[PDB]
Amino acid sequence: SDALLVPDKCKFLHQERMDVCETHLHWHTVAKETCSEKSTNLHDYGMLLPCGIDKFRGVEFVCCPL
């Protein structure tokens, strides 16, 4: 049940970006923006690869078509 990609009807964008390092809010926005810029909305966002106390490098968001 290791679904690290598109599960049901939502699009899962589970990718680790060990390049950038921002707060949970930044990746949330970048993630939401990437989906909202298209025809989808972020429902289940996730941030991996911790970089700092509040910073990360990974993002795992599931956005459904709207």
The annotation status of 21 as a binding-site residue, yes or no, is no
Smallest CA-to-CA distance from 28 within 50, 7, 40, 43 is with: 43
The annotation status of 24 as a binding-site residue, yes or no, is yes
The annotation status of 45 as a binding-site residue, yes or no, is yes
Burial class (CB in 10 A: 0-12, 13-18, 19+), 59: buried
Q: Which technique was used to obtain these atomic coordinates?
A: NMR
**Domain range enclosing 6:** 1-66
Domain count of the chain?
A: 1
Smallest CA-to-CA distance from 63 within 1, 9, 4, 11 is with: 11
The annotation status of 43 as a binding-site residue, yes or no, is no
3-state secondary structure of 37: coil
Q: How far is residue 27's CA from residue 15's CA, in Å, rounded to a whole number?
A: 11
Q: Is residue 47 within 8 Å of 60, Cβ to Cβ?
A: yes
The annotation status of 26 as a binding-site residue, yes or no, is no
Whole-number CA gyration radius for the chain:
12
What is the layout of strands, in order, in the sheet containing 58-65? 11-16, 58-65, 40-44
Q: What is the CATH number of the domain that holds 64?
A: 3.30.1490.140
Longest dimension (CA), the chain: 34
The DSSP output letter for 21 is -
Locate all alpha helices (DSSP H) within the chain, ordered by sequence.
24-36
